[PDB]
Amino acid sequence: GNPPAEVSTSLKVYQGHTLEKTYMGEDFFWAITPTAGDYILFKFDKPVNVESYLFHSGNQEHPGAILLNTTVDVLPLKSSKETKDKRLEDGYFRIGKFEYGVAEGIVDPGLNPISAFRLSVIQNSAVWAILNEIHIKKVT
């Protein structure tokens, strides 16, 4: 499973599809018409040495119900230059982005351990998106 975390979001829960249940692998999450400034937040119970991440949106039957113009940000516990240029003014590093509804990648190990993952919606969208896979892989 995923590292134990408190999860939260500015997107209103639709018909009991809680983000908690999605982070526990039980159900999907409806993200209805995301707006610029919306966020999805995963705050790990303890800092996590993260190897890689995978977020999937859309599904069979609803293949268009994907997250658009959303980034993947990580908040290191502590405060390469290539990764340095990805720093945002709030301390997060903007390391990933959704495309075709999928965001996947590696964490620069210089960032570890991570205290939070944040998905940031950058632009308005008319889609009723389905976030159906959240995978954060610990380092071994």
Domain positions in the chain: 5-138
Give the Cα separation of 56 and 108 in Å (integer): 21
Give the Cα separation of 8 and 60 in Å (integer): 26
5-138 under CATH 2.60.120.10, yes or no: no
> Between the CA atoms of 19, 50, 112 and 56, what dihedral angle is there, to the nearest 10 degrees?
-50
CA torsion through residues 24, 131, 10, 3, sign: positive
Helices (H), the chain: 19-23
Method by which the model was determined: X-ray
Cited resolution, angstroms: 2.0
Q: How far is CA 68 from CA 33, 108, 115, 129, in A?
A: 10, 24, 25, 9
